[PDB]
Design a protein around this ligand. Structure first.
Ligand SMILES: *C(=O)/C=C/N[C@@H](C(=O)O)C(C)(C)S(=O)O
Ligand SMILES: *C(=O)/C=C/N[C@@H](C(=O)O)C(C)(C)S(=O)O
Lengths: 260, 260
């Protein structure tokens, strides 16, 4: 029984390029497949941006309650939460929840702007020891996912490490760490992705992403039953510009790497 | 015609029974498939229980804030939220969110006890004009889903009509209808079911269900992009006790009934 064989078979049969990094926090062990290749993050980058604003809030203690104007011109495909508040305001906490738990691209843009642009999200990544991540565009163009383009990419291994530090480690202050985890656990978009490959009894927080080239991503923190948590990154992208999403590939990869 | 033939084709390759009821609120049109047969509700019954508690909160002011004790003996499969509060408390708002947005079966049992048992949830259904719904057992046994058993069943037609009345109609007070819709839109478990058959721009609130006999259910309110909402019930059950879940079949049914 061979995890590399299974992942290579999934990838080949899918017609795409699959990247996987698992961290088992029980013993610091990893399962890696194309873990040092760059992939387009798409909306999985919203974790870094929300965590950056959380970090800000450790020193601007009322920042999460700050109202932010939502104008009709701010609407970008998709905006299921912000469209309801156009011509009004949303707080940075509401925006962070919207960006994380829903598909909300306008909410992401407000986080980016709060951080002073894409470079602000990259600067946070650098501050917490992630030298791989880069954010260079706003929404929606950060999702173009063109093959060979390094913009708005990271590697599975780096993002697994970062997500571990953010959700289980000490990148954030305790309240901010707990907030992030509460938001990820309340994600609405994830049941077809990593979670579909796992036993139903396991608890998952996750952020999904999807863009050009059939790019289909998920990053997750997982609590198996009375076991130590796992961090799992599954990235996937395809050769055709308009390929269909493949959440089932991410599910299949999550089952392969957690079986046993 | 086209639709009916396609649903039958789907059903014939699915290895089970399929029940569908779509209400298009633009014109009150319906698309029905086995819509007067009984199916096991499993966790889709949590909608009726949360709504009955919302109804109670119209007259017991502050009911949703009321803390309820969680003890070890209360834990039933699955309990992702209630487990964190064992030897502690959850408020009726937290138990309603827990039951709606996650898998949590302990949270449902507390809603049922707040209503005076399974029969109190059936009484509420009757109070809002549903003469079909019938809750007869607590969690987890209400999910046995044995073929032929009338316990804990409804029909697609009745459930679609009830969900319309609850979410879009006047079965509840306006503040409480809005709370129900907010909870449903925040479901975490739905992305592989009805939602997986719909365009990504459409906004969905939904409640899934699973149980014995490979029972795989979803009931949803759907807001297509700048169109009047849809109600969709998709129920599915299989002939062998230990059959696997078929969320894909629900997604496929949703795509068939909305393609027109
Ligand atoms: C987060 O991952 C957001 C992705 N957005 C894109 C998608 O494919 O879902 C679009 C197309 C909505 S965005 O216009 O790039
Ligand atoms: C809601 O629909 C919950 C159903 N629960 C069951 C499932 O199939 O997920 C179990 C098996 C967890 S419960 O013990 O019946």
């Amino acid at each position: 029984a061979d995890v590399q064989q299974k992942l290579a078979e999934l990838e080949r049969q899918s017609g795409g390029r699959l990247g996987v990094a698992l961290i088992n926090t029980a013993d610091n062990s990893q399962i890696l497949y194309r873990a040092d290749e760059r992939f387009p993050m798409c909306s999985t980058s919203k974790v870094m941006a929300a965590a950056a604003v959380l970090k800000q809030s450790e020193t601007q203690k009322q920042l999460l309650n700050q109202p932010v104007e939502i104008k009709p011109a701010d609407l970008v495909n998709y905006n299921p939460i912000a469209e309801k508040h156009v011509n009004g305001t949303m707080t940075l906490a509401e925006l962070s929840a919207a960006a994380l738990q829903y598909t909300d691209n306008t909410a992401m843009n407000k986080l980016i702007a709060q951080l002073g642009g894409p470079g602000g999200v990259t600067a946070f990544a650098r501050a917490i020891g992630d030298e791989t991540f880069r954010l260079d565009r706003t929404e929606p163009t950060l999702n173009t996912a063109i093959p060979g383009d390094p913009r708005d990419t990271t590697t599975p291994r780096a993002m697994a490490q970062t997500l571990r530090q953010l959700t289980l480690g000490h990148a954030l202050g305790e309240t901010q760490r707990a907030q992030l985890v509460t938001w990820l656990k309340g994600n609405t978009t994830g049941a077809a992705s990593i979670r579909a490959g796992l036993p139903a009894s396991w608890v998952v927080g996750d952020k999904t992403g999807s863009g050009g080239y059939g790019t289909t991503n998920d990053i997750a923190v997982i609590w198996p039953k009375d076991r130590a948590p796992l961090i799992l990154v599954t990235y996937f992208t395809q050769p055709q510009p308009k390929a269909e999403s493949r959440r089932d590939v991410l599910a299949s990869a999550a089952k392969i790497v957690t079986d046993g």
